[PDB]
């Protein structure tokens, strides 16, 4: 059955953990095999487990990447939710911080069926040494 | 043309202002006439300016309602964005606070074409004396 509000809060916080540690296997594990990821929202979706793994491979490849929840997960009663996080990584040769909000819909097996990441360069902050 | 990241940031912050002051006319003004609101996401959409006005009428009717941005607006390059806010109002006879994340898609005239508010009772906090 479709994940309750509570469970969605649990699942979306766990996803941020996994991203923080770079556990690509576990991250990919969280997605339905026909899931889609739009990141950043606006770009063409990436489809299916194989492409997604590569996305997270390249994404978490090279620049050291931390992610942390910066507020409560907002969760609906229909297996969806949205959350704000801050992603630390190297951009354009500089340690930078990116503010993001991820929106996720889960299937009846508690897998991510759809993910969208809202952010752009306006949410981008370069850190001084 | 479709609103830039910067403009989206501006528009979504202005919406929160208007809600905070209860300017229903201006709020309704921000929406396309064929816009849809899902609030809370999961419930059936409300369609068009007339129903929307009533929604904001009832919504901002009775319980004193404040709303404030609690972090940066995440804005994409394709006329969409998402933001976190905290809504103060009276629920179930009690001054309460609700954590929300609104997701908005704008049209080429800078009007809100689609709004979704993510929150449920798990995001609800009742305030003591």
Curated annotation (Swiss-Prot), chains A, B:
CDD domains: ketosteroid_isomerase (cd00781). GO terms for molecular function: steroid Delta-isomerase activity. Its EC number is 5.3.3.1. Changing residue 102 to N: Reduces activity 4-fold. Reduces activity 10000-fold. Keywords: Isomerase, Lipid metabolism, Steroid metabolism. Induction: By steroids. It comes from the Bacteria. The active site is at 15 (proton donor), 39 (proton acceptor). InterPro entries: Ketosteroid_isomerase, NTF2-like_dom_sf, SnoaL-like. GO terms for biological process: steroid metabolic process. It catalyses: a 3-oxo-Delta(5)-steroid = a 3-oxo-Delta(4)-steroid. Changing residue 124 to A: Slightly reduces activity and reduces protein stability. Disulfide bonds: none annotated. The keyword Isomerase applies. Pfam families: SnoaL_2. Substrate binds at residue 102. Gene3D superfamilies: 3.10.450.50. Homodimer. This is Steroid Delta-isomerase. It comes from Pseudomonas putida.
């Amino acid at each position: 059955n479709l994940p309750t509000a509570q469970e969605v809060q649990g699942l979306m916080a766990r996803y941020i953990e996994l991203v923080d540690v770079g556990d690509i296997e576990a991250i990919v594990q969280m997605y339905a095999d026909d899931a889609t990821v739009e990141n950043p929202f606006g770009q063409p979706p990436i489809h299916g487990r194989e492409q997604i793994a590569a996305f997270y491979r390249q994404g978490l490849g090279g620049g050291k990447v931390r992610a942390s929840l910066t507020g409560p997960v907002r969760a609906s009663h229909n297996g969806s939710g949205a959350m704000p996080c801050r992603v630390e990584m190297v951009w354009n040769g500089q340690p930078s911080a990116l503010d993001v909000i991820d929106v996720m819909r889960f299937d009846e097996h508690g897998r991510i069926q759809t993910m969208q990441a809202y952010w752009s360069e306006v949410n981008l902050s370069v850190r001084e040494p």
